[PDB]
Symmetry: C3
Subunit: 260 residues, 3 copies
């Protein structure tokens, strides 16, 4: 292995082979770090998490195959997270308690995944993505940058279950899916769109449109929305909300003029 | 610290500083008790729970700040519960497995929180409150006495997400929210009201009224409800159900005549 | 006790009395095996699971009563599962992470229960049953063979909560309940029926019928359904899908001609 003299490893931690722990990594009590795991500098790994979780092939003969897991810098991984092999997570990742992340998945930077959330295999999550408590992300889902998935949201993939050909849901830039909503297979949720709480999304959602209900129905453009406390127009949200965003220290316009 | 000679502490338990464990406390295998935690007499702490969980300030320099957690007497805390600092829990608390409770929260007495439930920060829960499996309780929610939140219920707080001004849901005395229901931000659910299973509650619910659907719509007064097996009028429920209630040994009327 | 010389027991495992571990059982790091547990040959028990979990009677005087838990052969139990006493699980069981299973429950063979799923007490689950992520199975539910319960599905049991007489939901052979659906108490979901995603099922569902919505309404026979990618008729699904089924190596007809 390769563990930095500056890394902090608490009691109970169990470590396998081909593991690399960078400078200033703090690995809390009882974590289990299986083989082929690489933790980047300054990350914090929560108590009892288990990284490099066994893929199915393992169970064939109980011999662990190489399926490397990498986790970027300054991660803030909370307790008991379970993270599979063949997956990559970028920098400044942050999680809640008891989150599960499967294999063959890609998570960008400045992403957050709340308590109990379950990310399946072969999922793609971009940067500055916010996934709250107990969200279900099924295999083949595509979540672009700045997307927000609120508590208990569920993204499915089998259109006539159980079947052999799955279709991933794709959520475009800045879209917001409110709490307890479920999106049916292969659906496309367009940029800056808003899915109202509890909805059952059965058809694509066009850009900047608000849908609500079961089945979800279009009700208006997001620009119609006024802040309930201040009465100001809320969306596009990038212009009215910037906590934890790359433009926090400035304004979206100036920031995107630079980025582009 | 301060640990009672009569407390039982199993193997694997890890204890920090400024921890007080009262008489007849049984702390099961592998619990992690971080700093500033006070457990009151006769409580039972489930295997691997982690009490005094780190607040965000901790992560700044990995130096633990004082954020005292107190847990009342005769608690029956099941396995792997995670409980944050700056929170207070009363007597006779009971939980299911893998429950999470955040900071700056207050839980009364004779409260129950089922398996997977997630209580956010700055939440208020009164006495004799029943929260079942996997309920989501967002910051700023107010749950008064004798409220029942059934499995997978979700209480939200951001009315036009993502935004800066949140509005907590307030649930009044004896109200019942059936399974898989979601309540929108700032909504007021009145006393003895009944929210039918799976509903999407978008407007306040008046006292003793039954709402159902997405969006939830009023259908009748709870007094219209007849027990499906016995045909008797069910609500107000205090008069027809008393298991685990303070009037179990008597009748509601006699009991409330005394209490008041 | 009785532990086979061929069993593999990792570090941290804690074992009680009256425990029997058969040949080729692999018990991963830190599992807690309480009293009266019997694990059948070749099973794999995930890290930190806790088997023989305490029943309520335990808490009376913190003296563990005999409530035997049995787990059939070649189980693939993933991490942190919690399994109660007085329950029986058949062969080839498979689970996801952090699943909870209560007492007085019966699970058949070739059953799968995904991540976060919560099976309550006194539940009956047959063979070749598929329960996905975070499904809630309340006491008194009856799930027959070949049933599929997709993510976040919830089966309830108290028809006018809170009340004293519960009514279990019964799901017949091959039925499919899509994601985020909730079924009300005592409902009967008939064979080969299909409950569409997110539905609120309030009335029995007849055989081979598709219901959708809140409240769920019948829309057509499942035979009307065409595969979204291939355009072929999907149901009955036994004829179009056989991954992990007893007819995988043949065809349903030939297979059932033999079985019967
Ligand atoms: C989309 C949203 C912001 C509502 O916009 P809105 O302007 O408040 O809609 P209004 O209440 O002013 O009026 C909307 C009408 O559609 C209905 N409606 C509003 N939201 C609905 C929903 N989620 N589902 C179904 N119907 C809804 C209202 O009841 C009203 O119906 P009506 O014709 O009977 O009067 C809201 O539904 C929502 O989902 N907010 C997000 C809550 C959340 O999950 N936050 C994240 C968790 S913290
Ligand atoms: C409120 C409740 C008790 C129903 O009252 P009810 O008297 O049985 O209503 P009924 O079925 O007799 O008749 C109600 C009508 O409204 C509909 N309806 C009933 N419950 C509904 C619901 N939750 N959502 C939407 N529609 C509903 C019925 O289908 C029927 O509609 P119809 O006009 O097509 O006939 C029930 O909906 C409920 O939520 N029970 C709680 C289940 C639960 O979660 N227990 C806790 C978990 S164990
Ligand atoms: C039942 C199901 C397969 C849909 O059948 P369908 O043939 O695609 O229905 P269609 O979309 O072709 O047309 C159906 C009509 O009913 C509506 N509808 C379809 N599914 C609906 C649902 N779950 N709830 C409410 N309405 C629905 C459609 O929007 C359309 O309504 P319309 O009159 O406004 O056009 C689908 O609803 C479903 O639940 N699939 C399972 C998704 C899933 O959970 N997989 C498991 C998780 S991976
Ligand atoms: C900071 C923190 C977070 N978490 C987990 C809890 C939750 O599942 C997830 C998000 O917690 P959060 O960071 O407190 O929530 P966030 O600030 O992103 O969202 C909040 O603000 C947005 C704008 C509102 O719409 C939302 N409804 C609010 O919760 O992370 C924890 O468990 N502990 C923590 O200390
Ligand atoms: C007693 C007990 C409880 N729990 C957890 C499981 C669940 O998430 C929560 C409530 O379990 P419960 O006490 O068995 O359920 P309760 O008796 O409160 O509710 C029951 O009765 C009411 C009246 C019905 O409406 C309800 N649908 C029934 O479940 O506590 C456990 O995990 N293990 C236990 O041994
Ligand atoms: C194989 C495997 C499974 N699981 C858990 C994750 C999930 O909660 C449960 C099912 O995982 P799965 O076996 O990958 O899902 P399954 O193949 O049964 O279902 C899939 O195919 C069916 C036909 C689709 O309708 C469905 N939407 C797909 O997920 O088991 C894990 O956690 N890790 C694993 O390696």
């Amino acid at each position: 292995n390769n563990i930095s003299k500056s890394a902090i490893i608490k009691e109970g931690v169990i470590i396998g082979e081909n593991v690399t722990i960078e400078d200033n990594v703090y690995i809390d009590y009882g974590c289990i770090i299986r083989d082929n795991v690489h933790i980047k500098k300054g990350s914090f790994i929560g108590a009892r998490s288990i990284l490099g979780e066994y893929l199915v092939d393992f169970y064939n003969d109980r011999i662990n195959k190489k399926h490397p897991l990498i986790i970027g810098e300054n991660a803030l991984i909370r307790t008991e997270n379970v993270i599979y092999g063949d997956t990559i997570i970028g920098d400044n990742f942050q999680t809640g308690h008891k989150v599960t992340i499967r294999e063959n998945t890609k998570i960008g930077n400045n992403v957050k995944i709340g308590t109990l959330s379950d990310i399946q295999h072969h999922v793609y999550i971009g940067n500055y993505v916010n996934i709250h408590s107990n969200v279900f992300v099924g295999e083949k889902s595509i979540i672009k940058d700045f997307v927000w998935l609120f508590p208990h949201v569920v993204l499915t993939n089998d259109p006539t279950p159980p079947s052999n050909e799955l279709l991933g849901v794709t959520i475009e830039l800045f879209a917001v899916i409110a709490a307890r909503s479920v999106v049916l297979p292969g659906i496309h949720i367009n940029e800056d769109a808003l899915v109202g709480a509890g909805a059952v999304v059965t058809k694509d959602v066009p850009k900047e449109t608000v849908v609500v209900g079961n089945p979800a129905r279009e009700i208006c453009s997001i620009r119609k929305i006024k802040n309930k406390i201040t009465g100001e127009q809320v969306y596009p949200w990038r212009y009215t909300f910037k906590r934890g965003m790359p433009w926090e220290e400035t304004d979206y316009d100036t920031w995107i003029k630079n980025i582009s």
